């Protein structure tokens, strides 16, 4: 079995490990992936947080707080910042090579960041159904990646990610009426072809 890879393709989309694109425009802070799931120790708690990102635009700068080995290293506005260094510094590593920030954290964890929006965490064979979050459980089964925090499969992803917000009193996002044309391309069929 190979090494899986989340992603954040654009402002509001998410590609799970097993492979499931879905739409979730949010504006609160959300658990992208973690290990403290049900009956496990809880080593790492990668999070993600967006501001002004329900409608994609030149707005929507992302913020990412990754919590491994009792640490707090986080990143936004181009650079990476350490708010609390972690104990076993041996595994830590930062490779600012090219357009990316490759960032190792252990034997079986890695993070990639294009300095703008993308978040591609890479995990190894070690876990195999030990994680959960917006990226799912990493089990091979591709249609159980919508198991919410309350331990049930949902069908509508906009109710899924609302289960994974950290602040349980911020605003949960709104069920958008489904359509093939977003706001600007709504009733602008000219522009909708120049984009296609």
Partner 1 sequence: EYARTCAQEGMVLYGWTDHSACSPVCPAGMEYRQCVSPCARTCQSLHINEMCQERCVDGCSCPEGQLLDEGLCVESTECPCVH
Partner 2 sequence: DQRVSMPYASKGLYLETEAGYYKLSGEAYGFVARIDGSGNFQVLLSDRYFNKTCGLCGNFNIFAEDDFMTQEGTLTSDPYDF
Cβ count near 156 (within 10 Å): 10
Contacts 24+ apart (CB under 8 A), 100-106: 101/75, 105/44, 105/66, 105/68, 105/69, 106/44, 106/68
157 interacts with Ca ion by CB under 5 A: no
What is 41-53 written as a DSSP string? -------EEESS-
Binding to partner 1, residues 158-187 (CB under 8 A): 163-169
Q: Name which of 84 and 116 has its Cβ closer to partner 1.
A: 84
In the complex, the smallest distance separating the C-beta of residue 131 from Ca ion, rounded to whole angstroms, is: 10
70 interacts with partner 2 by CB under 8 A: no
CA dist 66 and 46 (Å) reads: 4
**Two tokens at 93?**
């590593």
Binding to Ca ion, residues 38-77 (CB under 5 A): none
Q: What angle is formed at CA 101 by the lines to CA 74 and CA 104, rounded to 5 degrees?
A: 75
In the complex, the smallest distance separating the C-beta of residue 162 from partner 1, rounded to whole angstroms, is: 9
85 interacts with partner 2 by CB under 8 A: no
34 neighbors 132 (Cβ within 8 angstroms) = yes
In the complex, the smallest distance separating the C-beta of residue 182 from Ca ion, rounded to whole angstroms, is: 28
CA dist 138 and 122 (Å) reads: 11
In the complex, the smallest distance separating the C-beta of residue 82 from partner 1, rounded to whole angstroms, is: 15
145 interacts with Ca ion by CB under 5 A: yes
Near partner 1 by CB under 8 A: residue from 50, 54, 65, 137: 65
Q: Name which of 26 and 106 has its Cβ closer to partner 2.
A: 26
Near partner 2 by CB under 8 A: residue from 95, 166, 170, 176: 170
What is 79-102 written as a DSSP string? EEEEEE--S-TTS---B--TT--B
The option from partner 2, Ca ion, partner 1, none interacting with 27 (CB < 5 to 8 A, set by class) reads partner 2
**Two tokens at 52?**
């002004």
Binding site for partner 2 (CB under 8 A): 27-28, 51-52, 54, 59, 169-172
């Amino acid at each position: 079995v190979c090494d899986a890879t989340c992603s954040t393709i654009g402002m509001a989309h998410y590609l799970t490990f097993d492979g499931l694109k879905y739409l979730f425009p949010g504006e609160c802070q959300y658990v992208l992936v973690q290990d403290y799931c049900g009956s496990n120790p809880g080593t790492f708690r990668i999070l993600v947080g967006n501001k002004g990102c329900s409608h994609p635009s030149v707005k929507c700068k992302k913020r990412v707080t990754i919590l491994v080995e009792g640490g707090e290293i986080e990143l936004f506005d181009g650079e990476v910042n350490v708010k609390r260094p972690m104990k076993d510094e041996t595994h830590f590593e930062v490779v600012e090579s090219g357009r990316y920030i490759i960032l190792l954290l252990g034997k079986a964890l890695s993070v990639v960041w294009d300095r703008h929006l993308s978040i591609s965490v890479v995990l190894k064979q070690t876990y195999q159904e030990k994680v959960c979050g917006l990226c799912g459980n990493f089990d091979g089964i591709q249609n159980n990646d919508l198991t919410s925090s309350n331990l049930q499969v949902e069908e509508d992803p906009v109710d899924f990610g609302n289960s994974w917000k950290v602040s349980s009193q911020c605003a949960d996002t709104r069920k958008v009426p489904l359509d093939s044309s977003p706001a600007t391309c709504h009733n602008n069929i000219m522009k909708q072809t120049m984009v296609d």
